Amino acid sequence: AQAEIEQELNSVKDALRAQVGALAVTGAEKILGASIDANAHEQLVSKLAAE
Amino acid sequence: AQAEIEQELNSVKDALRAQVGALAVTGAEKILGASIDANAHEQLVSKLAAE
Amino acid sequence: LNPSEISEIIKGRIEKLDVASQARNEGTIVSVSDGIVRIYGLADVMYGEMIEFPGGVYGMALNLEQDSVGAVVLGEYQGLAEGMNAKCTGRILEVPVGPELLGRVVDALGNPIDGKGPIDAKATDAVEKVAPGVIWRKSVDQPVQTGYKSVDAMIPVGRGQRELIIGDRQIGKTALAVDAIINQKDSGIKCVYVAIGQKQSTIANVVRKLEENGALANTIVVAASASESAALQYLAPYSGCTMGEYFRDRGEDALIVYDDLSKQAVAYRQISLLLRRPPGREAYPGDVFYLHSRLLERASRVSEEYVEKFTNGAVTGKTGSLTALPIIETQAGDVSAFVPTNVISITDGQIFLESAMFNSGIRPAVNAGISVSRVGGAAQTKIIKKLSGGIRTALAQYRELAAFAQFASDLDEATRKQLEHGQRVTELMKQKQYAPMSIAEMSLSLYAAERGFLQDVEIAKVGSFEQALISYFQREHAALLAKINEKGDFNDEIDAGIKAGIEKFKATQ
Amino acid sequence: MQQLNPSEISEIIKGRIEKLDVASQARNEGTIVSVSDGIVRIYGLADVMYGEMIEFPGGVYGMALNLEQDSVGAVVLGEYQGLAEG
Amino acid sequence: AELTTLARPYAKAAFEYAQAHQQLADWSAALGVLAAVSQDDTVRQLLKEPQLTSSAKAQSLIDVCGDKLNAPAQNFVRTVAENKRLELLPTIAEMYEQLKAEQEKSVEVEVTSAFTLSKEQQDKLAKALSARLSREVRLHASEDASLIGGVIIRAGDLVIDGSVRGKLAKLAEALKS
Amino acid sequence: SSGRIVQIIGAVIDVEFPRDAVPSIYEALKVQGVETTLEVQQQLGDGVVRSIAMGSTEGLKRGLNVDSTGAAISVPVGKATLGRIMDVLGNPIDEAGPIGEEERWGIHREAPSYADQAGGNELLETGIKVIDLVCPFAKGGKVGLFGGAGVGKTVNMMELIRNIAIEHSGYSVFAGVGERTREGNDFYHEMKDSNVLDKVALVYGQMNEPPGNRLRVALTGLTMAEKFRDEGRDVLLFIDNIYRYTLAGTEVSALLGRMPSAVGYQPTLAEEMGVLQERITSTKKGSITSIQAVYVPADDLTDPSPATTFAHLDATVVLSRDIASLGIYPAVDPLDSTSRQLDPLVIGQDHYDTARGVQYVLQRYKELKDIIAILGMDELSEADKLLVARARKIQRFLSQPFFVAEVFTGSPGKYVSLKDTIAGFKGILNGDYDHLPEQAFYMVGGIEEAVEKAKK
Amino acid sequence: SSGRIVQIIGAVIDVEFPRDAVPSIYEALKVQGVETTLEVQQQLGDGVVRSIAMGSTEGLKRGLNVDSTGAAISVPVGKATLGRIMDVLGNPIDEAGPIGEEERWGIHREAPSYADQAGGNELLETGIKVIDLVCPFAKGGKVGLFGGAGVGKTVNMMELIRNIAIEHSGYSVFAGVGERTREGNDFYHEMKDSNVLDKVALVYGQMNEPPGNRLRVALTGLTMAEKFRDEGRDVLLFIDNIYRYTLAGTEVSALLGRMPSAVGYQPTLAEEMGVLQERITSTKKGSITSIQAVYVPADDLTDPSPATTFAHLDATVVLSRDIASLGIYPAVDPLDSTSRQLDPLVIGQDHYDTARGVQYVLQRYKELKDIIAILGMDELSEADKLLVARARKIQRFLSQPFFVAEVFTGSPGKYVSLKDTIAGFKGILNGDYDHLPEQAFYMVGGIEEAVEKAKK
Numbered sequence A, B: 001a002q003a004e005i006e007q008e009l010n011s012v013k014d015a016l017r018a019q020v021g022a023l024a025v026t027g028a029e030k031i032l033g034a035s036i037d038a039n040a041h042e043q044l045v046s047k048l049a050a051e
Numbered sequence C: 001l002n003p004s005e006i007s008e009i010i011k012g013r014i015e016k017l018d019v020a021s022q023a024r025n026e027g028t029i030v031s032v033s034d035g036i037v038r039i040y041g042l043a044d045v046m047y048g049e050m051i052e053f054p055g056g057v058y059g060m061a062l063n064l065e066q067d068s069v070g071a072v073v074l075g076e077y078q079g080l081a082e083g084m085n086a087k088c089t090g091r092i093l094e095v096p097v098g099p100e101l102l103g104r105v106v107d108a109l110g111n112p113i114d115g116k117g118p119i120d121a122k123a124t125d126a127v128e129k130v131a132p133g134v135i136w137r138k139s140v141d142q143p144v145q146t147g148y149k150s151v152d153a154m155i156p157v158g159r160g161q162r163e164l165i166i167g168d169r170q171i172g173k174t175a176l177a178v179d180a181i182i183n184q185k186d187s188g189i190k191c192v193y194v195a196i197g198q199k200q201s202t203i204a205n206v207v208r209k210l211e212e213n214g215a216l217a218n219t220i221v222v223a224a225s226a227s228e229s230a231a232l233q234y235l236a237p238y239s240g241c242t243m244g245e246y247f248r249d250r251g252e253d254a255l256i257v258y259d260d261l262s263k264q265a266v267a268y269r270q271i272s273l274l275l276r277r278p279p280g281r282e283a284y285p286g287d288v289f290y291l292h293s294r295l296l297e298r299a300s301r302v303s304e305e306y307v308e309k310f311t312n313g314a315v316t317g318k319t320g321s322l323t324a325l326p327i328i329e330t331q332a333g334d335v336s337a338f339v340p341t342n343v344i345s346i347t348d349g350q351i352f353l354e355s356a357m358f359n360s361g362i363r364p365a366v367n368a369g370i371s372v373s374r375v376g377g378a379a380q381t382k383i384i385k386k387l388s389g390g391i392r393t394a395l396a397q398y399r400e401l402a403a404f405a406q407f408a409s410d411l412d413e414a415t416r417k418q419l420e421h422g423q424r425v426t427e428l429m430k431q432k433q434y435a436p437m438s439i440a441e442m443s444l445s446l447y448a449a450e451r452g453f454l455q456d457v458e459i460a461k462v463g464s465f466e467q468a469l470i471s472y473f474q475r476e477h478a479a480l481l482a483k484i485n486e487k488g489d490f491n492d493e494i495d496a497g498i499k500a501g502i503e504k505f506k507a508t509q
Numbered sequence D: 001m002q003q004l005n006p007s008e009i010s011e012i013i014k015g016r017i018e019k020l021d022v023a024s025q026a027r028n029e030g031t032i033v034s035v036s037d038g039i040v041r042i043y044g045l046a047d048v049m050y051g052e053m054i055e056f057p058g059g060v061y062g063m064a065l066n067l068e069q070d071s072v073g074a075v076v077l078g079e080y081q082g083l084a085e086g
Numbered sequence E: 001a002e003l004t005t006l007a008r009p010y011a012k013a014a015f016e017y018a019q020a021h022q023q024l025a026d027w028s029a030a031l032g033v034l035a036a037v038s039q040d041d042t043v044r045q046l047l048k049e050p051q052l053t054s055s056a057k058a059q060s061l062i063d064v065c066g067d068k069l070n071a072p073a074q075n076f077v078r079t080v081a082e083n084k085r086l087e088l089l090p091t092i093a094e095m096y097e098q099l100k101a102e103q104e105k106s107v108e109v110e111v112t113s114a115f116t117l118s119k120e121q122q123d124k125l126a127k128a129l130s131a132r133l134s135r136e137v138r139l140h141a142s143e144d145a146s147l148i149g150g151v152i153i154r155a156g157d158l159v160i161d162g163s164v165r166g167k168l169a170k171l172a173e174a175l176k177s
Numbered sequence F, G: 001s002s003g004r005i006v007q008i009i010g011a012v013i014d015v016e017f018p019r020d021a022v023p024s025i026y027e028a029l030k031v032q033g034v035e036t037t038l039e040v041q042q043q044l045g046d047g048v049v050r051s052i053a054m055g056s057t058e059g060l061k062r063g064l065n066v067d068s069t070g071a072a073i074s075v076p077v078g079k080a081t082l083g084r085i086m087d088v089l090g091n092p093i094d095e096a097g098p099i100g101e102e103e104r105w106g107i108h109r110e111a112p113s114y115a116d117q118a119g120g121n122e123l124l125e126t127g128i129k130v131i132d133l134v135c136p137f138a139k140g141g142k143v144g145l146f147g148g149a150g151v152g153k154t155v156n157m158m159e160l161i162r163n164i165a166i167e168h169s170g171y172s173v174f175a176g177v178g179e180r181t182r183e184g185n186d187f188y189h190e191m192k193d194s195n196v197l198d199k200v201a202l203v204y205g206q207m208n209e210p211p212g213n214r215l216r217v218a219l220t221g222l223t224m225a226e227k228f229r230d231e232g233r234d235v236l237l238f239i240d241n242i243y244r245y246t247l248a249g250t251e252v253s254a255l256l257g258r259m260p261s262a263v264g265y266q267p268t269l270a271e272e273m274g275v276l277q278e279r280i281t282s283t284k285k286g287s288i289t290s291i292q293a294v295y296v297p298a299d300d301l302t303d304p305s306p307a308t309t310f311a312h313l314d315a316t317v318v319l320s321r322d323i324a325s326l327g328i329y330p331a332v333d334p335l336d337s338t339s340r341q342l343d344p345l346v347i348g349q350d351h352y353d354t355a356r357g358v359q360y361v362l363q364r365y366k367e368l369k370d371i372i373a374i375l376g377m378d379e380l381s382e383a384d385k386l387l388v389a390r391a392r393k394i395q396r397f398l399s400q401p402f403f404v405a406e407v408f409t410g411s412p413g414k415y416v417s418l419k420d421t422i423a424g425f426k427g428i429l430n431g432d433y434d435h436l437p438e439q440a441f442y443m444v445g446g447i448e449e450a451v452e453k454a455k456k
């Protein structure tokens, strides 16, 4: 009884978290797909060349 | 307990619906490796409308 | 359903992202067939190393040919395709370990499948390891009570011993091992149950029975069901062994059950034939002996010096152990098969279950003539060691005598005495499922038989006499049972105490 | 398609680049290609007869039993562990 | 058995001979011509016929290559045909180039970025890779719009990914796991 | 894009596609000039895929164009499938027109998770004495009828379909995997004339069919049962012969380039069985009660296919040829047959002790068989003589005339309740019928009819 | 020079070396960086050698450099090996530091020539009734303890070590081949507590170790025994399981590219066994007395491995599962067991007649055993009834409690002498004990104690 309630409750948090994570990744792709241009590559290719 | 879960679920659902924008811009900022605010707040208000 | 908590949980993964560059070794998928993937280009891949595929799918490198790498998928393979990139992680197969796994159901890789949340373990360990060498071990001299008088009296199991449970289908092999796990809830021994190639509803019923008997909080359940990849079914016994070894290496005792090593051998035969390795004695790989010998040699007792060296002096003056109860299925009693022959040759003893005895109502169905324990009396408490000496060989001789004297005319007193006693011990060895007996309860039952008190009792009344006697001693003699149950000690005071109680019982009940 | 034959080794192929007809010049002599479990495979000996005796370095002798299209499979009439490729 | 397992004896024999006689560039052209010539739709058919002898298929390929095959290269083709391996000619050239490159302490590095990078950046990546690998590096630069930003370097089996796409993928796996 | 046939060997076909357009495992493909369907089994490399034809390959040739459909074989599911007959690809084969489907589901799916499992123990009465006594069934559980050729499996199942439909009010799904076409016609008309047809979905892939059909028909029927279970219903899933799914896999295994295992079986035998068997289960959403017939090759229960099937079932009913030879039907063997429900905590002590008592008597009678054959019954002890007499009566009382077996002999069928079953065997064990003749127990339903038969 | 690892499949590894620098057959190789050794089994051609790893392959990668050592696996020999525990490569596996070695010998050697063979027949007393009666041993000879799983091979070897090794004044070698790691630890502590360890060289290769180790540990232990023999000493060599050397060859044979023979064994079964067994011999220089335990797969003595082993032994002791299943220990079969020393010209007519007398009585009883079970004892002749009773008593007087078996039996251990054994069996054969009950001979050392047990 009581343990099974917490088993269900945490499964609901994880089912919601799985949707929030997918949306956050999709959102991040669109932000980067507009914020990045030639002024950023000169700060990434140069960064990699030191690594 | 199943009735209480159904009754409380909409209270968190509208809260995560508001947090998606913060999670997306913070995720993009880490990936960019530099501050993104100057190229992200106008993206949040235009892209969050589709989530 | 608390908000903002989920945000900080997600922020903890975003804040800790590996944003820097990494130098990796890589390849390309060439073919995808029956859970087997072939790759070109993995120059630094080690044997048994984990391979990372797109979408978090993982594989393991098993064939390191001169021009190609043969890998097996650790999950569903149907999503993989030709041209996908194969990457290399400089890590051997590892699984989570610790007390956080107790009371949980996990897959062969340690992922939770019970829906009770994440496992906050603080330690991982390699799935494939070599057992501790000769100089680090110690002789077996501590008991492991299964709760069954037929097993605990005639085929004793000691801490660090390996005892095979063998028979045909549907005769109580799982019932014997699950009751042995249930009896450890108060013993201080941690338990591990490994399910290989079983249906998920059978696994769920065993977990429900462990929970119904109060034994689940002391058990780790490792599941590799019938629909899972042959690689996960092949690896599950080694993953469970690694979870049990955590307690052994830290000066603690553990017990592990492999519900079907014959199903692990069938999963390994599949992988090997799909990798095109040449077959042996029954289409099984040449190294099917080494599959089980490498697993079963880890179950052992380690010396105080080994525990002291492993824990860097944090634990001292304590030995550690891992006891194993492997299960094997035979076809119509045929023990000549390649896999049963190999496993019978590795364990420290075996418990043979017979279908003819099971159909005849002897339900624990232990054939005393074929079953044997190589540790013997060293694995028993003082009271059971003295009260059970010679019972196994006496029953073996009674079975022969009963067949030899079956249609012959009336024999001498020596023959009647042996036959009448063997019939009573045969009826006494019968026990019900989910009903274990303590050292004192088994001791009263053994004492009443070997000291001659059952000679006046009818065969059809032996079960009723035992149940009534135990109920009597539990009421009129509770302080004596509590004294016998402290360490299973025996002396003239306890012997006379039991004698006086049994005499008073029969003279008044 | 078909696996590598015993004659398909780089030391032999490199010899045929120099002289196309390098073999058959000494039909009574061959070179050891591989050694395993008392069996020796040799390239050459184009005129060996079935059951004839073969002489190896160190006074060791063998017998020709497999006269295949590309090589000779011979069994050692004593200890084989001293024989080697080449 | 892979074609690399089967072509190894021939490519290693051709390389050891070409190296010993200082003919590495002549055999690279000869094997490049045979590998190219054996892949032609009319020659591929001629090499598949069941009625022709090994010496006939070999002479036919030698007569077609002519000038490009010195006497040693012609002796090699008659050997490849005698063993019935003419289908491996494309693979034989490839292993020959790998032994040659490793001998010549040379490495061909493929490079990909979202959009074009300057000669100053290519020469900065080239000196870094040559200092790390201790070999001469030949950067085959190219572009791939699939990258949101940054660059990926492929020095044979070794890969170095500094792209924004690889970081988005690490986050997607970190959140799903 | 599209590919080209490069090789054809029996039911197996290899197709080459452009490197950027290679189809996925289990993806359905269609040949352009004949519309024959192919299912991709593996990717061989260089853009080549290996597939199994879902029809006849006679008349196909190398170089024909092949179209990739972008998805696995998809079949219609839901209410529109009730009272209709379909093939492996979900096409109607009853001449009644197109199926009024609302949606289609792909035939390949993962089994329900460990957390989705159901713990049901509710007893299901079959009305058959031997089954209700030693093999008690449960709602939402799995049953297997094991037996060699001509021992009673199709008759003993059709009697269960008739008896279980008395209390069950939901839907049923029937999958005919590699068996007689005449029996599919007989069953369809029987239900159509009885007006039972509007609550049953029928799928067929009989012995006349090529290997690809016989290999995937089981998945098509199960996909329809999973739709009804997932809608929250309680459904019955009947599989005409589950061994044919494994056998169709053996015919194709060597053509798929796999090395054979023991007695010529595919190396994937246990995995092919587990991938199908684990989907046939009850969940927290709805329940599937399933009955499957299991063929036993050359009467050998130790054969790899039957041996691998026992672990997937809750109740195992083992039919015997030696028992069928004596005249006893149903020809169930009490000593080899068993159920997970045969527990004191599930069925109560009275049933449990009656069943255990019957098994003890039959086991002791089996031990005396060789002595009785050599020396006769008269040499046994006074105790063994009484036990053998009761064993012979128990063995005959286990027989029962069925309502589907009436055509074979003429006798009317009998339905016996669990209460009447326990009372009859308990009385024979106690000795309440020691005076009645041994032939009075043969073919009589309830125990009171044995008393009336003894009057003649 | 050095080579590179080119391929790894299980325990087998291929290494390439320059064509002018290929390592010899049986040559030892070392992997760079990783702590592993390889043994060349075959030279494959084109500079490649096939080898078996002498350690686990989990860390190994293709392209690791490997160094040729120019010789076979070489182990320490002589006085420095006494009182030490070692692995296959001769490394110390005890915490006692480096071995005080002065010489190293390669593990691969030719057997002594036909002209070097010894001819001694000096009888050796074991203190065990059955063995001293039907299986008399001799100094410098070979003894084999044949038996299946769980019948007493290690226990009888432990009793023989106690009754021979301790009392002996020469050197001993104990080799644990495919033994349980627990048995090796139990034996070490017994030698340590008994102060015997300074006379024994211990070599261990248990079941947890790779196939290359189990394939060569027998050659390591034998190389140490050969050094002592060639010095003119009398040596004892004990081998817990010689079957495991054959099995390691079967496990690796197929990956070495060898086609299987009958019962799946390696084609080289008889030569691999002959190359090892012909070195375990006594010569004109010095002597080796050896006791080997032989595992019998599934108790069938006709299996190719046990069947090929009998011809290499002077004394063959056979342990029976049917005797062990009756509580009788030691579980030795007097009819199948034998020794080359059982000759009146080697021992004496009195001993020989007693042994053949016991065998005659037990052989006749074997045909009557099956008769009595169906038609009863009362139907046999007056001479048969008496003989059957003596046979059942003889069968029990073969039993004896051992000092190493007190943990299993509970009773104390008994040593019996050759004359005591002869006198006891002659008494039962002549009828001097016909009045004693059958149970009085079960587990009682000499004949006197049987007369005393009858009074209890």
Ligand SMILES: Nc1ncnc2c1ncn2[C@@H]1O[C@H](COP(=O)(O)OP(=O)(O)OP(=O)(O)O)[C@@H](O)[C@H]1O
Residues within 6 Å of the ligand: C168, C169, C170, C171, C172, C173, C174, C175, C176, C363, C364, C431, C432, C433, C434, F311, F339, F340, F342, F343
């Ligand atoms: N002591 C007992 N007393 C009575 N019944 C028992 C006893 N032990 C087991 N049984 C019963 O007998 C059956 C044994 O089933 P169990 O699963 O344990 O056997 P198994 O050999 O593991 O079968 P399987 O091959 O399917 O795994 C069950 O119905 C169980 O309840």
Ligand SMILES: Nc1ncnc2c1ncn2[C@@H]1O[C@H](COP(=O)(O)OP(=O)(O)O)[C@@H](O)[C@H]1O
Residues within 6 Å of the ligand: F147, F148, F149, F150, F151, F152, F153, F154, F155, F156, F179, F241, F293, F295, F329, F405, F408
């Ligand atoms: N009373 C009966 N008398 C004769 N045959 C019977 C009887 N009851 C059942 N049968 C047999 O039952 C069989 C049903 O199918 P079966 O042969 O057992 O399975 P399968 O055909 O699927 O392998 C029929 O072939 C029929 O011969």
Ligand SMILES: Nc1ncnc2c1ncn2[C@@H]1O[C@H](COP(=O)(O)OP(=O)(O)O)[C@@H](O)[C@H]1O
Residues within 6 Å of the ligand: C372, C373, C374, C375, C376, G147, G148, G149, G150, G151, G152, G153, G154, G155, G156, G329, G330, G331, G402, G405, G408, G409
């Ligand atoms: N002489 C004996 N006395 C008592 N028990 C014995 C004896 N010989 C064998 N056994 C029993 O068999 C086992 C010992 O035999 P072991 O040496 O381990 O057999 P194996 O041949 O398989 O190595 C123990 O379980 C022991 O009880």
Ligand SMILES: [Mg+2]
Residues within 6 Å of the ligand: C173, C174, C175
């Ligand atoms: Mg079980």
Ligand SMILES: [Mg+2]
Residues within 6 Å of the ligand: F153, F154
């Ligand atoms: Mg049928």
Ligand SMILES: [Mg+2]
Residues within 6 Å of the ligand: G153, G154, G179, G180, G183, G240
């Ligand atoms: Mg041993």
